[PDB]
Amino acid sequence: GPIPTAPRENSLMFLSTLPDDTVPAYGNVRTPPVNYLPGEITDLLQLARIPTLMAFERVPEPVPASDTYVPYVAVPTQFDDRPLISFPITLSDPVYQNTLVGAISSNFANYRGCIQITLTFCGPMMARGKFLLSYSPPNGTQPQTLSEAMQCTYSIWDIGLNSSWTFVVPYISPSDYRETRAITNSVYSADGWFSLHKLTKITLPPDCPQSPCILFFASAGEDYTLRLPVDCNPSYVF
Amino acid sequence: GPIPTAPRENSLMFLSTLPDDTVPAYGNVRTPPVNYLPGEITDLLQLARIPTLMAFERVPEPVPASDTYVPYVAVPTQFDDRPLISFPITLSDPVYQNTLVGAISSNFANYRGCIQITLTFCGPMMARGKFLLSYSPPNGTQPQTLSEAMQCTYSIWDIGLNSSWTFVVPYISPSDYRETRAITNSVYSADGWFSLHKLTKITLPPDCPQSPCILFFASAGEDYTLRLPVDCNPSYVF
Amino acid sequence: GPIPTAPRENSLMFLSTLPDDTVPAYGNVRTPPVNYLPGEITDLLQLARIPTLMAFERVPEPVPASDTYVPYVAVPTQFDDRPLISFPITLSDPVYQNTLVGAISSNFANYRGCIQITLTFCGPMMARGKFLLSYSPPNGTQPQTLSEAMQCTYSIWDIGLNSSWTFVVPYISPSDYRETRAITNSVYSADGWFSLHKLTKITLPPDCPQSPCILFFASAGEDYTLRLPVDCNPSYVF
Amino acid sequence: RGNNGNMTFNYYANTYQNSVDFSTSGILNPLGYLK
Amino acid sequence: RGNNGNMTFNYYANTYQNSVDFSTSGILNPLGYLK
Amino acid sequence: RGNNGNMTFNYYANTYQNSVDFSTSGILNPLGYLK
Amino acid sequence: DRVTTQTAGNTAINTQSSLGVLCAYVEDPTKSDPPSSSTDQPTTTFTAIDRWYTGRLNSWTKAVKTFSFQAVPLPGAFLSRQGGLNGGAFTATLHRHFLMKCGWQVQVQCNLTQFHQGALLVAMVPETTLDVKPDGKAKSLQELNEEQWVEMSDDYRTGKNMPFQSLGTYYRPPNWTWGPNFINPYQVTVFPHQILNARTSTSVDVNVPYIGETPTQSSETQNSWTLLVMVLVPLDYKEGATTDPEITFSVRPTSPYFNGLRNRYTAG
Amino acid sequence: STDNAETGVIEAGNTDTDFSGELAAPGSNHTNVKFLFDRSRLLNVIKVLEKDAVFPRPFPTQEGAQQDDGYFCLLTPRPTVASRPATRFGLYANPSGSGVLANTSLDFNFYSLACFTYFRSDLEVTVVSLEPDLEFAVGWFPSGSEYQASSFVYDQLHVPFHFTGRTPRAFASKGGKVSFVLPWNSVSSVLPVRWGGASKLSSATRGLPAHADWGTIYAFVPRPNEKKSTAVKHVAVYIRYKNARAWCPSMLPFRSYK
What we know:
The structure is cut from a larger assembly and holds 3 copies of chain A, 3 copies of chain D, 1 copy of chain G and 1 copy of chain H.
Chain D: H1 14-17
Chain G: E1 4-8, E2 11-15, E3 21-23, E4 53-56, E5 69-74, H1 76-80, H2 89-94, E6 97-110, E7 117-124, H3 141-146, E8 175-178, E9 193-197, E10 203-208, E11 217-218, E12 225-236, E13 247-261
Parallel strand pairs in G: 3-10
Antiparallel strand pairs in G: 1-2, 4-13, 5-12, 6-10, 6-11, 6-13, 7-9, 7-12
Chain H: E1 2-3, H1 33-36, E2 41-49, E3 72-74, E4 80-81, E5 84-85, E6 89-91, E7 104-105, H2 108-111, E8 116-129, E9 137-141, E10 151-154, E11 157-160, E12 169-171, E13 178-182, E14 191-192, E15 216-220, E16 234-249
Parallel strand pairs in H: 2-15
Antiparallel strand pairs in H: 2-16, 3-15, 4-5, 4-7, 8-13, 8-14, 8-16, 9-12, 9-15, 10-11
């Protein structure tokens, strides 16, 4: 006998994100297997953990063309009590725009966990110096003073045999998740600032080249997590 | 093979109170858990049992403005054989209109169980007096005489060390349930009257202030129950 | 009660290749059984393995009519360092067009496994000679020289008591499957060339007839496989 | 329970029909106490 | 098997979904042999 | 698993609902190593 | 353990600044099966192709801008003899087989010392058409000598200049804007790579297996792995230091399988 | 902590590596490849056949070619032009000119998160009419196959051969939708997201793969050629990747700073 059925009001609706299969039209097809091919990607956070280059403007004020964005910050000999480079911890900011962490995360609504900033000193081996790397919680005014950076979460990095320092930005958030994109620039989307201060000047023996450069990488920590995939930005194709 | 089915006549009908789930569009979402947050409300009768203030007009006849409704009844020194305050046991009456019992129950069609009226004497400690609190079943004429109140369900409340008296209004109904709102003012919706009579006059030593006040609370008993949710009154937003 | 159902968006769609049964209208019919009838065909590759005649043009240059296509290649006495016959290993080529391998495979999109070319010497028993049968992988230029054929996959066939030679064309492909029809003439559809060279001249005692003929068959190997049935070519009916 | 009556059979898994909270590492309660 | 995938459940009996012949009373076979 | 929630019952066989590869004869792996 | 001398066949290459060997994306890119899609017997390895091959790149200078790069296609550099990379028996085997499957061991040397600053990104990048001009023809050695370095600009960032089929006079010519063989220059560190920093090392090691869209690919056309040497930090030094340091590279194939033995390749 | 980035390996650190703290607990898995790509998105918009088509010629197409552009949809994330696979994506910025405007397509959502070199999945195809109450049908033919471009006569009505065949045909109801899932049908093992090889030994284009597709679909009215009006009708194509797997980690597209 015919089974009595009550079709719901949402019948014949196509739903793009429906978690169910549809009818097969061309079954009994065996594809070539894939034993030989290595490098299988189970999860996109495996590529988020890979460090990639950030971007900054090269030098103020005159530049031949504004497109001259550069993956390093040059260290001048001149001393003034302001950071050499600073950027907000906000994953929609241009400093993350061409990193894998920013590009992957920008297609997700929320993130959780730590961002890992990696620095690389590309100057000569004879160079000696010290840098203070400081992460500031959100505040009414961004800190600029080295004394103000010293009051925040900070680590001192020494130039020596090992050329690199991995700075893990701590996850300090009022909510369990944070917004990837700062629409209203609220506390849930902008998590303060990271800043670089020189502690001592870089010292050089004579005939060394002046102004060495620190190469910047951005990467996801091992606790980093992404949630709620959203529509992409198609701006890259135009 | 295709299963033979017979869709019923009410197919594709949207029913707002249907006791069944619908299709999920955005599953596999984990929300932040709620271990830290106390005060979880399982049932609205838990807030119905909490006593809240009733409302009466302050004094007859002249008032500066009719909006001067007050949570207490002042006790004058003058004696006349009428109750000081009286109100019908009818949950749509203005005396319950801003209590939690009346506001919660007004969104339900039926109630069962006892209403608990709580009195609080806010006068000075040196004051002494006695009050008769009487609940009348429905009648052709509301009782006004203290002798008539004495023939009903009544309790005598003495002013002393303990400042409060909880009067449980008994559930005396012909039907198992009673209507919340008196449309036709039938026996199923209006359950008589509660009245306050002074038994003796309040006595004061000199330099006490005259006319002390009794603070009124309304609350649901432990046997109180509500049934059949109805459409709300949106009058509050205008 | 009526079972709640959610019909998908592809409801009432007729799909010609759907792997499911439909409703029977005229059941309880018993057909005459088939015990007596032999030669049951389970699989079309059983007929693909059966050798059938290829086709070539008879002789250059003048022919009475261009329709004179012939299942053999005549062997002239004249010597020049070019192959007597050559054809691409491409299952849409006219040399396979009326073979069972080509006709069956042309209704499929992909093939895998070896093609087996069978030669038959139909000359007189007194004839003696040797032939070099060579299969060339794909190249920028088709090989013509006997020295170039010797560098490829080749076998030397001697005329003697046994009149036939089965040449298995090896399956050498970059992908696991190959296209039946050369649309773009890519490496995935055209698998090089088979060529016939005479090694020594055919020697005859006097009063033998000149120019004996080699009869050609095409057949599927035991590892041959076909996949993805496609629409037929109805060109034969017009 | 909630306003649900079709209790016999659920087609979708619980983590698709509803959210669940993540791990970190009747008779009525009174809303107030006196000491 | 044939071009059929919905193998779990058949609603109609076999003698209604298909014909059957009445009683009277892979690895491939070669279509030819040599003696 | 994938974006799939209706886990209880599958109507079509696996080799009709999906492809399968032919025979020839969480915790994350690092994409690079140092010797 | 910075002193390592790696031996293969009759060739041994040495470094005293070894950072280790980058093994991606398997624990050993030499562990591998006969390719399942061809049934003829493969031509496997032997001790005269089990060896290293060495070639020269163009000199790195002060004038080389950030993200300027050199592209070395594999096995295309052997076919084109790019940078003097004669492959001997290996190239002789390449021209005589239709299919080829192998991984690669690469080491790039650049002779830095103290009093110099700069960094070179050395990556094996799948998959590139960076050896090909935008008109669709491959670069000649004269053109590779004239560059002398490929400048990063709007093209090669968006893929706008990748080789294409022209539509013809029938269609309107479209505004070409984007292509999937882009280089995102900030993201090249996703690939199996090491950084030739002037501070810490003179040589880098990357070890990669075979990959492809098929379990074997055509010997003449495949570009499944490309040695990319890209500037991250430009060269700077005071006068009196060594001008124009040279860049050399050493290439070894791992577990080669050859299929489709035939005569030497002649183009059409 | 101190490292050498020249190693090529960097360990994913935590707050407790240098400072005092602990791991943030995991709470999501949406970056899974099988979960992420398993959602439908707009592939292409094609015109509806009302007669037996002439399939678009290979490039370069010359003047005077009689062919039906805009009716066939390659099931590719890769860029296409004139229903044939392309390397560069192209668009038209200005209306003025003379010549045929070629159809081009992309999956922007795919390349926004590929991020890998090789891809393989089954493909759910969903076909939605852009015209209201349209009765239409979907014809598909696999990778390596071709369109059967002719008609047959029934009762002096020309009936095109694409109404039938061994490949799936799906008839929608009046105002209905078509949905079905397709297997990986290529001769190739996987689809190359980016490609450096060449398909032919001569005159091929570098970076243009020949069979990186799940076949081609087209929309047609289930009525003979005599029934025609001038009003052109349009159909949108939706694709969803089933059981998606990925290999060989790679780059994401450049984001301009202007």
